[PDB]
Design an enzyme around this catalytic site. Structure first.
Site, PDB file in Angstrom:
ATOM      1  N   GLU A 100      -0.447 -12.787  -8.280  1.00 29.76           N
ATOM      2  CA  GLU A 100      -0.270 -11.867  -9.392  1.00 29.76           C
ATOM      3  C   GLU A 100      -1.519 -11.949 -10.257  1.00 29.76           C
ATOM      4  OE1 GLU A 100       2.304 -12.503 -12.647  1.00 29.76           O
ATOM      5  OE2 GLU A 100       3.348 -10.586 -12.418  1.00 29.76           O
ATOM      6  N   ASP A 129       2.144 -11.856 -23.796  1.00 35.49           N
ATOM      7  CA  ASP A 129       1.513 -13.082 -23.333  1.00 35.49           C
ATOM      8  C   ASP A 129       1.380 -14.079 -24.477  1.00 35.49           C
ATOM      9  OD1 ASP A 129       0.739 -12.983 -20.454  1.00 35.49           O
ATOM     10  OD2 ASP A 129      -0.218 -11.110 -21.097  1.00 35.49           O
ATOM     11  N   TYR A 132      11.230  -9.234 -10.480  1.00 38.84           N
ATOM     12  CA  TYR A 132      10.732 -10.293 -11.354  1.00 38.84           C
ATOM     13  C   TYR A 132      11.895 -10.811 -12.189  1.00 38.84           C
ATOM     14  CZ  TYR A 132       7.204 -12.908 -13.982  1.00 38.84           C
ATOM     15  OH  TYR A 132       6.434 -13.896 -14.545  1.00 38.84           O
TER      16      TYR A 132
END
Ligand SMILES: O=C(NCCOP(=O)(O)O)c1ccc(OC(F)(F)F)cc1
Ligand SMILES: O=C(NCCOP(=O)(O)O)c1ccc(OC(F)(F)F)cc1
Ligand SMILES: *Cc1c(COP(=O)(O)O)cnc(C)c1O
Ligand SMILES: [Cl-]
Ligand SMILES: [Cl-]
Ligand SMILES: [Cl-]
Ligand SMILES: [Cl-]
Ligand SMILES: [Cl-]
Ligand code: NA
Ligand code: NA
Lengths: 265, 395
Positions: free
Chosen positions: A49, A60, A175
């Protein structure tokens, strides 16, 4: 091409889970990032990824925030990232390559043109971090038109409607999000219900991500029924800790990935 | 699935990580419920009246239009508690947070104005308030930072990215994605993901509602145009909303032109940016050619935001509202002119709206026109900025 399908069939034949590292393309520089990626593969990474540096990575935590800034400090652009992606595919014909994108980089020069570029360089999947399934129609349509798997986050609290949408719309892998909040190895539970209902709804095989930083977490995820695990911040921490020692960086990267990949057998 | 339309034409939407969608859906449901609840409306109205000081005056400015056929009124949001229009909507959002059982408030701020408004609403309503501010903005807004701290708010400097407003925005969203069960994100303008552009408009629309009533009372007819500065869009959509269906009333939004559009140092994404997806929304924004989010610029920190609310982009696209820009120098002249000829110190944000009305008057001084400028704030905060510029240029 169907690289995730071939990889999962091959892993299933070996009673084995996938281990999938995440790194930022061009962190800390283009040449060193290419070596970093080759070492992760050489150490046993099943898939990749890969993040494209973006000015405002709002999903993030600090570790990957800092990788983006390191890449920007080297002048890394999306165009250079796609040049890197083409070279990576040329060296490694079968490993699945997934991108982690923010929406504006996909939308910028046209959604369709972005996914066409992914297809041309050999990318297998795209996860757009700030496009929820509810907004995803133009992205997943463009993805599928160019043989790119659109990847969707299945969060901890997913109601049944979200599970059905994620199962129907995603490809390649699901995911499976391990918690709320943002990325980071500083914050660390695969619920058997989501994994079971995803299989019940014929979803793409589930990979668990967020906080995965220890080998026993890889084994725990496979044992819960996930098809494997994704580890981000833990890998990027090794890059950050060893900036001044490019060679020691590659060796510590080699050891960690080999340790994590062994945990999936 | 949503209760309300998240889009204004092509603009808007809910472009957040999946983990934040339940928080947005919960907020939309609480807002729709509250809008139907007379007890909520009475509580909100009571705070607006007895704490914030509504209705605000509508002031005719005789001296600055002398010798022309312009009649100019100022809607006096500068007289609202806190000195800017932002107080209206933070009181409504604070009541929403309470309706949802939230005891904590997250807010972003760049110029510190929304930070102060969030802090005062949080102090009044007993909410624990934390405010994210880019470290560059913390350094240049020490008065507003001290106001937030006096009001019990925790101010958290943000050092990531460009250490300014958009980076504070990211940090607020990162926090909320992990804390939304107990914290409400009190977004500070008519932008961001749905439902915020809608909520902020509805909690600012009393500006235009009052203006319509007051101008009808004083002049017996609607304005020819209403003019408001546009940073994120909240004071402008608050003025515009009740006039959108009065198709004879012009709606003019004023973006900051900074040093001039041709210099690239400006804050006018609506007319001179490019549609992108960021800040949770599809909207015009200032961005590089490869889609990195850019830095805006204005003499006025409150207009220094590189995108704009999606309803403004929509009203422009259909021709219902017109958007223009005003430079630093034009805003400075309007600031000086209001001080000297009406005895009102306007916010440098609001001075952009005033400057465009002055241009409308001066360019066509025999045109009969009835104008309202939204005076979104007072300019006590700006007198050092204005002093320093005037001293450096020898005035
Ligand atoms: O795969 C990702 N990061 C690497 C693994 O996470 P971590 O190990 O915690 O750094 C990753 C995945 C999705 C993401 O955004 C959103 F969730 F919204 F889609 C951000 C990061
Ligand atoms: O402009 C904004 N904030 C107002 C700040 O006001 P001030 O304190 O005067 O700078 C602003 C804040 C958030 C936003 O969306 C998102 F949350 F997603 F980022 C868009 C605009
Ligand atoms: C914040 C602010 C503005 C700009 O914000 P909008 O959301 O565009 O209204 C304008 N005037 C004042 C006084 C402000 O504090
Ligand atoms: Cl479906
Ligand atoms: Cl009301
Ligand atoms: Cl709770
Ligand atoms: Cl009425
Ligand atoms: Cl343009
Ligand atoms: Na703006
Ligand atoms: Na700026």
């Amino acid at each position: 091409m169907e690289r995730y399908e071939n990889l999962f069939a091959q892993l299933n034949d070996r009673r084995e889970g996938a281990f999938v590292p995440f790194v930022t393309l061009g962190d800390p520089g283009i040449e060193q990032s290419l070596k970093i990626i080759d070492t992760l593969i050489d150490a046993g990474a099943d898939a990749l990824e890969l993040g494209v540096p973006f000015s405002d990575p709002l999903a993030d935590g600090p570790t990957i925030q800092n990788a983006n800034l390191r890449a920007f400090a080297a002048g890394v652009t999306p165009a250079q990232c796609f040049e890197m992606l083409a070279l990576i595919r040329e060296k490694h014909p079968t490993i699945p390559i997934g991108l982690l994108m923010y929406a504006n980089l996909v939308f910028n020069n046209g959604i369709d043109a972005f996914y066409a570029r992914c297809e041309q360089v050999g990318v297998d999947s795209v996860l757009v971090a700030d496009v929820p399934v509810e907004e995803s129609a133009p992205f997943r349509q463009a993805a599928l038109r160019h043989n790119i798997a659109p990847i969707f986050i299945c969060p901890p609290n997913a109601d049944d409607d979200l599970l059905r949408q994620v199962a129907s719309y995603g490809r390649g892998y699901t995911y499976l999000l391990s918690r709320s909040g943002v990325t980071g190895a500083e914050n660390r539970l695969p619920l058997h219900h989501l994994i079971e209902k995803l299989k019940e709804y014929h979803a793409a095989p589930a990979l668990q991500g967020f906080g995965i930083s220890s080998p026993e977490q890889v084994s725990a995820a496979v044992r819960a029924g996930a098809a494997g695990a994704i580890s981000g911040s833990a890998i990027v921490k090794i890059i950050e800790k060893n900036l001044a020692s490019p060679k020691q960086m590659l060796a510590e990267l080699r050891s960690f990935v080999s340790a994590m990949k062994a945990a999936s057998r | 699935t949503t209760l309300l339309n998240p889009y204004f034409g092509e603009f808007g939407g809910m472009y957040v990580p999946q983990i934040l969608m339940p928080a947005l859906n919960q907020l939309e449901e609480a807002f729709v419920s509250a809008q139907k609840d007379p007890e909520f409306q009475a509580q909100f109205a009571d705070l607006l009246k007895n704490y914030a000081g509504r209705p605000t005056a509508l002031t005719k400015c005789q001296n600055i239009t002398a010798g022309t056929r312009t009649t100019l009124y100022l809607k006096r949001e500068d007289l609202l508690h806190g000195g800017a229009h932002k107080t209206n909507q933070v009181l409504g959002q604070a009541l929403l947070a309470k309706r949802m059982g939230k005891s904590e408030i997250i807010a972003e701020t760049g110029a510190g104005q929304h930070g102060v408004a969030s802090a005062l609403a949080s102090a009044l309503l007993g909410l624990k308030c934390r405010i994210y501010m880019g470290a560059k903005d913390v350094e240049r807004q020490s008065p507003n930072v001290f106001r937030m701290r006096l009001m019990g708010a925790e101010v958290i400097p943000v050092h990531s990215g460009s250490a300014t407003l958009k980076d504070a925005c990211n940090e607020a969203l990162r926090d909320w994605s992990g804390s939304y069960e107990t914290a409400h994100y009190m977004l500070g303008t008519a932008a961001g993901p749905h439902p915020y552009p809608t909520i902020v408009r509805e909690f600012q629309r009393m500006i235009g509602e009052e203006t319509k009533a007051q101008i009808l009372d004083k002049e017996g007819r609607l304005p020819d145009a209403v003019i408001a500065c546009v940073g994120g869009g909240s004071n402008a959509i608050g003025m515009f909303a009740d006039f959108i269906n009065d198709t004879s009333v012009g709606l003019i939004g004023v973006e900051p032109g900074g040093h001039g559009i041709e210099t690239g140092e400006h804050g006018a994404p609506l007319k001179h940016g490019r549609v992108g997806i960021y800040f949770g929304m599809k909207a015009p924004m200032m961005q590089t050619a490869d889609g990195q989010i850019e830095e805006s610029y204005s003499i006025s920190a409150g207009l220094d935001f590189p995108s704009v609310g999606p309803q403004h982009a929509y009203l422009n696209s259909i021709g219902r509202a017109d958007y223009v820009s005003i430079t630093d120098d034009e805003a400075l002249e309007a600031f000086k002119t209001l001080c000297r000829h009406e005895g009102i110190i306007p916010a440098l944000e609001s001075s952009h709206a005033l400057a465009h009305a002055l241009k409308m008057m001066r360019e066509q001084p025999e045109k009969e026109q009835l104008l309202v400028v939204n005076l979104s704030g007072r300019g006590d905060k700006d007198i050092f900025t204005v002093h320093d510029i005037l001293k450096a240029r020898g005035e």
